[PDB]
Amino acid sequence: ADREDDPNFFKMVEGFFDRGASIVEDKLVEDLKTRETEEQKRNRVRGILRIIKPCNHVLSLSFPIRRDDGSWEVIEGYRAQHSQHRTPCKGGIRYSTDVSVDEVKALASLMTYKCAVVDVPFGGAKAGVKINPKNYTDNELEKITRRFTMELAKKGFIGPGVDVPAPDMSTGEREMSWIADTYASTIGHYDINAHACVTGKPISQGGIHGRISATGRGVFHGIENFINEASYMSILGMTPGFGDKTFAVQGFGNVGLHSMRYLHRFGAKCVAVGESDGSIWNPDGIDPKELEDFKLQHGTILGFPKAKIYEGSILEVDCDILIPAASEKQLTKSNAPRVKAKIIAEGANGPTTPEADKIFLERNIMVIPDLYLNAGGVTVSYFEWLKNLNHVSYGRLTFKYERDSNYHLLMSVQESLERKFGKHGGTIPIVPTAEFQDRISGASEKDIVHSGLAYTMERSARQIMRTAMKYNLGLDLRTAAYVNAIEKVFRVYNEAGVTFT
Amino acid sequence: ADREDDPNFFKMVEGFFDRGASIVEDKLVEDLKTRETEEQKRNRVRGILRIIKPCNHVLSLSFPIRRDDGSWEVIEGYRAQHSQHRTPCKGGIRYSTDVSVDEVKALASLMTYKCAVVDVPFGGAKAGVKINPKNYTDNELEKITRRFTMELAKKGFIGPGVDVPAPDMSTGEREMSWIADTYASTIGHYDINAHACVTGKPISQGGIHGRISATGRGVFHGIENFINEASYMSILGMTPGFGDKTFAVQGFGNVGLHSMRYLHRFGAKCVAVGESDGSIWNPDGIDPKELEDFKLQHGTILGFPKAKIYEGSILEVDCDILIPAASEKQLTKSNAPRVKAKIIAEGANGPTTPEADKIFLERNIMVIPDLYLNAGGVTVSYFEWLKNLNHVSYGRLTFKYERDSNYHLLMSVQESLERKFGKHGGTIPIVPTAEFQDRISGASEKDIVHSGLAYTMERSARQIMRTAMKYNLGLDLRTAAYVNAIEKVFRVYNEAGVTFT
Amino acid sequence: ADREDDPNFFKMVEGFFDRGASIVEDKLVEDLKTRETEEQKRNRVRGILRIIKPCNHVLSLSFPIRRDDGSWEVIEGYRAQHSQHRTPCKGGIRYSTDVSVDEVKALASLMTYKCAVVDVPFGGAKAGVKINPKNYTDNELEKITRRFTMELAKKGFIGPGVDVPAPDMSTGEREMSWIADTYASTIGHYDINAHACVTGKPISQGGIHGRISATGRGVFHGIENFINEASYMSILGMTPGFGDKTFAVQGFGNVGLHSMRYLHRFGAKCVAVGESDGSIWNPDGIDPKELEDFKLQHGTILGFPKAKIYEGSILEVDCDILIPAASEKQLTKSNAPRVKAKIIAEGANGPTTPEADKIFLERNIMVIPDLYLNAGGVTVSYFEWLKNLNHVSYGRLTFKYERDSNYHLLMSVQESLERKFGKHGGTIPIVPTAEFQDRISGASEKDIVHSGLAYTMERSARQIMRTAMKYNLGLDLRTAAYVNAIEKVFRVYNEAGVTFT
Ligand SMILES: NC(=O)C1=CN([C@@H]2O[C@H](COP(=O)(O)OP(=O)(O)OC[C@H]3O[C@@H](n4cnc5c(N)ncnc54)[C@H](OP(=O)(O)O)[C@@H]3O)[C@@H](O)[C@H]2O)C=CC1
Ligand SMILES: NC(=O)C1=CN([C@@H]2O[C@H](COP(=O)(O)OP(=O)(O)OC[C@H]3O[C@@H](n4cnc5c(N)ncnc54)[C@H](OP(=O)(O)O)[C@@H]3O)[C@@H](O)[C@H]2O)C=CC1
Ligand SMILES: NC(=O)C1=CN([C@@H]2O[C@H](COP(=O)(O)OP(=O)(O)OC[C@H]3O[C@@H](n4cnc5c(N)ncnc54)[C@H](OP(=O)(O)O)[C@@H]3O)[C@@H](O)[C@H]2O)C=CC1
Ligand SMILES: Nc1nc2c(ncn2[C@@H]2O[C@H](COP(=O)(O)OP(=O)(O)OP(=O)(O)O)[C@@H](O)[C@H]2O)c(=O)[nH]1
Ligand SMILES: Nc1nc2c(ncn2[C@@H]2O[C@H](COP(=O)(O)OP(=O)(O)OP(=O)(O)O)[C@@H](O)[C@H]2O)c(=O)[nH]1
Ligand SMILES: Nc1nc2c(ncn2[C@@H]2O[C@H](COP(=O)(O)OP(=O)(O)OP(=O)(O)O)[C@@H](O)[C@H]2O)c(=O)[nH]1
Ligand SMILES: Oc1c(Cl)cc(Cl)cc1Sc1cc(Cl)cc(Cl)c1O
Ligand SMILES: Oc1c(Cl)cc(Cl)cc1Sc1cc(Cl)cc(Cl)c1O
Ligand SMILES: Oc1c(Cl)cc(Cl)cc1Sc1cc(Cl)cc(Cl)c1O
């Protein structure tokens, strides 16, 4: 992911952390619920922060699997649990040769800070299996994930109340299904909540509506919240709204594909899509549906008819909004001065280096941070988990009751008015509007996911704005986010019996 | 140190492994129970060996502890489990700033190879907590080990049937007691075998006789087995026996102190004792009991009256036998040409580098390998574990029965002879010899430990000699040991169904 | 099996049971520890016996497996637990299309009666998977047994202290290994005794010496105990001993092959070996070692050079002893009048029908019953289980102690005599005989298995003889066996909240 500026992903995130640690250190000694004072309160805060930064647990595994051609192979895997300040750890599983102890630790800590930003009660965790999925058959991949689950289960790295994985790079519903099945068929066979051991499951296996596209939907909302402020767009030299905007996304998987689908829906036009092979381009825009079909049938976006094979880094293309949705450290000190985009919407985790962040602050480029912007995935994963614990489809017990109820409520206003305006008025039909007619039986699963996600992205967005203001951070939203996150994680160690001298 | 051949400890052991892997690879394709043939049998062996080398599990921990002065501190710890080919993993816990992921992995794998050499049914494991014990109070140390136990317990890194720790550098009965107590009071409170979760415990807590001095006793036996062969001493230019031998030990702790006590008992005289501060020397010998008292009262061996402060590396002193009983990589390419000793008895784990091994083979210096020589500790740890599972003091149920039994057996020969040689002979008292009188009621715990250890060290010693011969390895006992070890670990992997038909 | 007499396998055993139930019903009302009397004591015995006959639990399973060619297949399986009067149930696993609910129930009950006869503290159990192993690959078989284990484990039909399987028809070490591995890697991963969940395991996986040939060895002993009584051979018209005897075995697997090996060792000559394809014959005898090689290389005994393909039912061949070691109901009312053999040694379970038993009693043919004769397998399975619970190789802790001990004991007689017969005698070396020299270090695993089995077969044999006498049952050993068995199982009921209250 670079040579000159390839800081260790974990140290990189610690940098992001330490930055916010400075900014809020005062509000913390303030809110510190201690009878002691001065330097002891200053010291205590530092001690607590020193606890939060390092990952509490990291499991490195080396297990064998029998390949299809009879041969034996040893594959490596890791799962790090950054924090248990909130009982169930949460974090996906990545399948890639790029994975390593440090990459996983970094991702794990990003998970807990992001959960805090978005108010999801999970400490962060992350897993990685060092393989290139494309070099294995479906049958070998199944053996790999099922075996990996058991090793995690035996050491306490997976379970409804201990640690709940989910998809990430090169893993999806299929893998999640295998994980759930392995867990429920063995260790959790007596557990009524066995299927809540993992999220991102297929809908038919206890998964939840819109989880696959949840990150993209969330990316849309995160951009929407800022792109409609004017108090922010005036500083970038842009008009609010999506209608006259162009964007380019690096990555065309679960994050990239859906981010693109949603932005295109509200008027923004996709100017370029990138992948590992390369990228494509078209100033008149590219349609998300057609591109997905081409990719689906040909296995690559390159060669797409309604566009041209671009030659010159998808990140440097000319557009209003750049959405890196691939891997980490894609924007560094080297390519940063060349982004051409005014808004960097981080769909991926850690796509920009700290050094690249500076250049972006100088060139007046707004970087909507990953720990807020991509949290739509974990947010809906939280909903999936909750659904598995309740064992019911949201609304099932209340549809008829709320429907009958709303009609009687409306009938109460109708009758009251006919009672008043006796014969003068006549019949005064009080009927639902078309919109309320669709909400007549109350919320369903799909409804809750959508409105719940929009609500979360909005609540957290304001929180970040209020914080950027209170500390005059300008377009340094990342720092505002870590500030909010440290504050929330602090609340748990602080007020807690532990730390009461 | 010395700055020259300071290799990755783990890689170093892998080197030792790969060496033996070559030497036995043929006897393995031979004993391979496969219907297939040629390269497939050759390939299968390589695949299995590739499984055995890497550690299966490594847990890295970062947990906080409240220091005595109220402050918060984060301490790091690790426990690696190299192999589970034998269900309970076994390995000590080291307290040192020198500990790291690699050091622990290396030690862990040495544990499994050593258990195999000595026929103890445990896969290897090892733990390390990165602290210098001397910079903490007893109360802080207790909090550190108890908390470390819980973290290991919750992730499956300690338990009677999963993983059984023991002492190592800077840990002893005290720490083991804390570990047992923490485990038994929490997770294992219902477990009838809870106290078998750890070994090296104080005798009053379920520990076993002679475990503290077990490594020293074993070091004595390992040296005895070779120093009395002539077929080996002729090649070193020495006479068999201990009576006219001198030795120097680097380290004066659990290994060093007892190795010294036992060698001194059979006539060998200790010429020099070394520690981290430095060493002392006296050509007429130093007495183990007096040196221990001085050390006990003054906290250091330096300044001992019946000896002089030596200035010139304890490893280079002039003597017949050198016993490094401290830490790893103490004998390298740099100091090797200067040992002056003909026999290097490795009390410590990995004290000599591979490059140092060559120089030792050329200068015709016999290196009695660590995976055999120091295994007296694990061997007796195995006895402690067995004792905890049986819940009885060895002999308690049989003392009176065997005593009465032996007298009637002896009376049977007495009466038979008086019956024959009627009045010619007269009374023909058949009485035990003084030695048999002490064995009249059968073995006690102490008896089983001593005779069990001697037996083990002897059985394994012959096995190594037979192997050094079969492959003409000369004074390369280390390689003979790994050969024996790979052979034994191999057998659990071979078997049909296991690595598959 | 016929169309004439092919009684229901279960009903058939109930018949055998009811027969003995009558014979001992009186000694039971006698030994009944009741204050009440007459018919109430008579009634209570009947009630208890009504409890013992039916199997307590039977699990029928239907689970899918993915065949190698991608297709899906549903396989059927069952495991019955006849009695829990002794906590761990014990019984093998059969792979055959002949398996069914009734066959397994019958086998299960035979297991508990046989364990009682042989004094092994296990209630009986049995499993069967309805497949012909030859129509599946090794990989499919592995999936089949591993999946079957999990289904049994989840419903409490396998575990160290609940139910311990073992081999039977078409299953061996390999399958047992898969079972142990599946159990220990999942449900029993924390269990220190996980590997005792099954027996008949490969030696390198915790199996025990001589388990494979244990049934054959036991068959030898069972025949030996009766063939050397004269008080029994006079009634058959035979001389005691093996030297001048000929035999024919139906079945050349784990039971048949070893029964043949052991009888041939003590002078008896094998005249014919049978299999499903057919049989072979040679009046001068057939050598067990050569026949095994031919079978091993060609997959069939037919066509063996040092013998001829026999055409006429292996059971009707002319010989002194007939050993049916295949499946049940091979000797019925139809072929019984044609056995030509004076002794029927039942290696297999239920090879003779009740109706065939009559004809055998009339023709004065002694039928050494299966519940005694083939119990060598379970007996040694019991030793394997015990070994797994103790986690040590028998003798390992005591070899050197007992060796040193015996020499001092012998030295005590030597010194006592030299003390007496001062200079008259001179040196009076007291040295072990060659035989005692091999027993100098005490018993090893192999020693305990052999001597423990011989002891058991002998103790039970006398018990049966004493019972055949006390009731003048003549050559009706089967009934004597069930009498002994009901007595032992009933004892457990004549005191467990049963006869009481
Ligand atoms: N639920 C989720 O999955 C969530 C994921 N995220 C974030 O998004 C990333 C996950 O993407 P998912 O894992 O969603 O993506 P998926 O694996 O589908 O992404 C696939 C795309 O990534 C592209 N890609 C990979 N590496 C590069 C590269 N070096 N340069 C250009 N393109 C590249 C692939 O091209 P190609 O196929 O040729 O390699 C492919 O188009 C994570 O890092 C994570 O932080 C955040 C929240 C939720
Ligand atoms: N059961 C057991 O304990 C077993 C131990 N071993 C081996 O021995 C080691 C364990 O020793 P224990 O843990 O037994 O030792 P203990 O801590 O008692 O050893 C204490 C001694 O180690 C000396 N020491 C440490 N570092 C150095 C150095 N760089 N140079 C010179 N001397 C040094 C100390 O000097 P100072 O006090 O000034 O630091 C002290 O005299 C392990 O590495 C292991 O491989 C082998 C088998 C079993
Ligand atoms: N641990 C144990 O296994 C124990 C077993 N036993 C007894 O031994 C029997 C088990 O044998 P295992 O199951 O040991 O035998 P294994 O499957 O090895 O027996 C294989 C032999 O059975 C022969 N066979 C099967 N059916 C017939 C038939 N209808 N006619 C002629 N030969 C046949 C086979 O011929 P083919 O290959 O062509 O089918 C083959 O030679 C049981 O009934 C049991 O009572 C008793 C105690 C312990
Ligand atoms: N690739 C792709 N996936 C889709 C599409 N439509 C639905 N899905 C699946 O369903 C989820 C997307 O749901 P949405 O289409 O965004 O739901 P919605 O249309 O916004 O719901 P409404 O606003 O009430 O109409 C993902 O998890 C997909 O698996 C599509 O057009 N393309
Ligand atoms: N306090 C103290 N304890 C010691 C000393 N030396 C050894 N020990 C400890 O106890 C042994 C003491 O053994 P006894 O003194 O009980 O040993 P023993 O039975 O004569 O040993 P053997 O002669 O080899 O059979 C070791 O296990 C040490 O842990 C010493 O000098 N002082
Ligand atoms: N299939 C088979 N296995 C055998 C035979 N002979 C011995 N065994 C084995 O008994 C083995 C170890 O046997 P040893 O200790 O060398 O046997 P012995 O030499 O003590 O064996 P026996 O002659 O049966 O008493 C197991 O691994 C079995 O495979 C045989 O003829 N056929
Ligand atoms: O680990 C496996 C082994 Cl030994 C054999 C097979 Cl046929 C598959 C696997 S993967 C796996 C699958 C499940 Cl359902 C459970 C576990 Cl415990 C597994 O390891
Ligand atoms: O972990 C500890 C906390 Cl939070 C507070 C205190 Cl006063 C001690 C400890 S150490 C410890 C000791 C035991 Cl007996 C059990 C556990 Cl669970 C410990 O962590
Ligand atoms: O049941 C299986 C599934 Cl669903 C997938 C694979 Cl590849 C193998 C099996 S068999 C099996 C093997 C193990 Cl080790 C554990 C379990 Cl519970 C199994 O079902």
Side-chain angles (χ1 to χ4, degrees), chain A residues 139 142-143 146 181 185-186, chain C residues 143 146-147 150 182 186:
Chain A
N139 183 258
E142 178 170 338
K143 283 193 181 73
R146 282 184 186 287
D181 187 63
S185 297
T186 64
Chain C
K143 284 192 182 73
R146 283 181 185 289
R147 177 57 181 272
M150 276 296 322
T182 302
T186 63

Side-chain angles (χ1 to χ4, degrees), chain A residues 2 4-7 12 16 329-339 344 346 350-367 478:
Chain A
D2 227 46
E4 237 154 298
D5 175 16
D6 203 56
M12 173 174 117
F16 294 158
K329 307 185 283 192
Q330 285 299 121
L331 263 16
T332 69
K333 185 172 188 177
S334 300
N335 59 180
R338 309 197 277 287
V339 297
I344 303 296
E346 295 186 331
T352 70
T353 54
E355 201 64 20
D357 259 321
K358 292 182 184 180
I359 301 178
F360 284 164
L361 276 170
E362 317 179 328
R363 317 228 289 96
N364 266 178
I365 306 301
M366 181 184 69
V367 183
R478 189 188 305 294

Side-chain angles (χ1 to χ4, degrees), chain B residues 86-87 118-119 382 386 394 425 427 429-433 439 442-443 448 455-456 491-492 495 497-498 500, chain C residues 142 174 177-178 190 192 195 202 204-205 391-392 396-401 404 408-409 412-413 415-417 420:
Chain B
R86 282 302 202 228
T87 277
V118 116
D119 292 320
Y382 171 45
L386 254 24
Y394 205 105
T427 69
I430 298 298
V431 170
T433 64
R439 283 164 170 276
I448 292 296
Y455 175 81
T456 294
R491 262 186 350 270
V492 192
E495 228 52 17
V498 183
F500 290 53
Chain C
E142 177 169 337
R174 185 183 63 180
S177 182
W178 288 329
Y190 277 131
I192 189 172
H195 295 73
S204 59
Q205 318 286 102
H391 301 84
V392 232
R396 165 63 179 283
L397 305 181
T398 52
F399 290 144
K400 186 174 194 297
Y401 191 84
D404 295 347
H408 280 125
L409 198 157
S412 293
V413 68
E415 279 194 14
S416 278
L417 291 170
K420 211 297 185 303

Side-chain angles (χ1 to χ4, degrees), chain B residues 181-448:
Chain B
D181 185 61
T182 303
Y183 187 84
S185 297
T186 64
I187 283 65
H189 72 290
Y190 277 132
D191 197 344
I192 188 171
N193 297 310
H195 295 72
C197 71
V198 62
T199 56
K201 300 185 303 290
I203 299 175
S204 60
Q205 320 286 98
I208 198 168
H209 184 97
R211 173 61 186 81
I212 293 176
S213 63
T215 313
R217 204 165 212 279
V219 164
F220 164 75
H221 285 125
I223 293 175
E224 176 187 62
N225 278 291
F226 283 89
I227 209 172
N228 288 335
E229 262 303 79
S231 150
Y232 273 112
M233 300 294 102
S234 68
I235 318 179
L236 306 187
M238 293 163 88
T239 58
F242 285 108
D244 50 357
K245 298 296 179 302
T246 65
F247 65 97
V249 48
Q250 177 197 39
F252 193 55
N254 289 157
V255 267
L257 164 68
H258 292 109
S259 297
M260 178 191 183
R261 289 182 58 247
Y262 292 106
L263 288 202
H264 173 272
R265 174 178 300 179
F266 294 73
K269 65 180 188 185
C270 186
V271 142
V273 180
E275 264 185 345
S276 299
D277 323 294
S279 345
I280 56 169
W281 175 69
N282 185 317
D284 301 296
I286 302 169
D287 184 88
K289 184 60 194 186
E290 324 187 82
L291 214 215
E292 192 194 344
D293 298 319
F294 185 90
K295 171 69 179 176
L296 218 301
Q297 185 183 299
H298 298 294
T300 174
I301 56 172
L302 298 187
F304 181 67
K306 306 194 188 304
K308 295 203 300 306
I309 285 63
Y310 188 87
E311 191 55 57
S313 160
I314 171 83
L315 309 161
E316 307 182 8
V317 71
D318 173 40
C319 58
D320 294 308
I321 314 153
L322 175 69
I323 308 175
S327 58
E328 67 270 28
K329 308 185 283 193
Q330 287 299 121
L331 263 15
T332 69
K333 185 172 188 176
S334 300
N335 58 180
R338 308 195 281 286
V339 297
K340 274 89 170 181
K342 296 300 300 182
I343 298 172
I344 304 296
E346 295 187 330
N349 275 318
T352 71
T353 54
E355 201 64 20
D357 260 320
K358 293 182 183 180
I359 301 178
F360 282 165
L361 277 170
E362 317 179 328
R363 318 228 289 95
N364 267 175
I365 306 300
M366 181 184 68
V367 184
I368 303 174
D370 53 4
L371 68 167
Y372 155 67
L373 206 268
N374 71 39
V378 209
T379 298
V380 179
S381 273
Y382 171 45
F383 301 164
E384 188 177 332
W385 186 73
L386 254 24
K387 174 191 177 184
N388 297 327
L389 305 188
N390 285 98
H391 301 84
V392 232
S393 300
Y394 205 105
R396 165 65 179 282
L397 305 180
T398 52
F399 290 144
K400 187 174 193 296
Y401 191 85
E402 265 208 68
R403 188 183 192 283
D404 292 347
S405 205
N406 283 148
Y407 279 117
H408 281 126
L409 197 157
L410 250 45
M411 194 58 209
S412 293
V413 67
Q414 179 174 305
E415 280 193 13
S416 275
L417 290 171
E418 296 183 321
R419 183 181 306 127
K420 211 296 185 302
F421 291 59
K423 278 281 87 168
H424 265 72
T427 69
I428 302 175
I430 298 298
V431 170
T433 64
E435 297 73 10
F436 183 64
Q437 186 67 50
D438 289 356
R439 283 164 170 276
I440 197 71
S441 295
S444 64
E445 178 175 299
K446 176 180 68 160
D447 287 335
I448 292 296

Side-chain angles (χ1 to χ4, degrees), chain A residues 156-323:
Chain A
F157 282 77
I158 179 165
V162 302
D163 196 352
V164 181
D168 195 70
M169 296 193 83
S170 296
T171 56
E173 290 183 301
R174 185 182 63 179
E175 287 70 33
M176 301 308 105
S177 184
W178 289 328
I179 294 164
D181 187 63
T182 302
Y183 187 83
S185 297
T186 64
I187 282 66
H189 73 289
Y190 277 132
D191 197 344
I192 188 173
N193 298 311
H195 296 71
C197 72
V198 62
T199 58
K201 299 184 308 288
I203 299 174
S204 59
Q205 319 286 99
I208 197 169
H209 183 97
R211 172 60 185 83
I212 294 176
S213 62
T215 313
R217 204 167 214 276
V219 165
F220 165 74
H221 285 125
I223 293 175
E224 176 188 62
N225 278 294
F226 283 89
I227 210 172
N228 287 335
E229 263 303 80
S231 151
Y232 273 112
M233 298 295 102
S234 70
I235 319 179
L236 307 186
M238 293 163 87
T239 57
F242 285 109
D244 49 358
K245 299 295 179 303
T246 65
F247 65 98
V249 50
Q250 178 196 37
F252 193 55
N254 290 156
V255 268
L257 164 69
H258 293 109
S259 297
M260 179 192 182
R261 290 181 59 247
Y262 292 107
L263 289 203
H264 173 271
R265 173 179 300 180
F266 294 72
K269 66 180 186 186
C270 186
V271 141
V273 180
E275 264 185 344
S276 301
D277 324 293
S279 346
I280 57 169
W281 174 71
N282 185 317
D284 301 296
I286 302 171
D287 183 89
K289 185 59 195 185
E290 322 187 83
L291 215 216
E292 192 194 343
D293 297 320
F294 185 89
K295 170 69 179 176
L296 218 301
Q297 185 182 299
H298 298 294
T300 175
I301 55 172
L302 299 187
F304 180 67
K306 305 194 189 305
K308 296 203 300 306
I309 285 62
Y310 189 86
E311 192 54 56
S313 161
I314 172 83
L315 309 161
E316 306 183 9
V317 72
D318 173 39
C319 57
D320 294 310
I321 314 151
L322 174 71
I323 307 174

Side-chain angles (χ1 to χ4, degrees), chain C residues 203 209 212-213 217 257-258 261-262 265 292 446 450:
Chain C
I203 299 174
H209 182 97
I212 292 175
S213 63
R217 205 169 212 275
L257 163 68
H258 292 107
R261 290 181 58 247
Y262 292 108
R265 172 179 301 179
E292 191 194 342
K446 175 180 67 161
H450 293 170

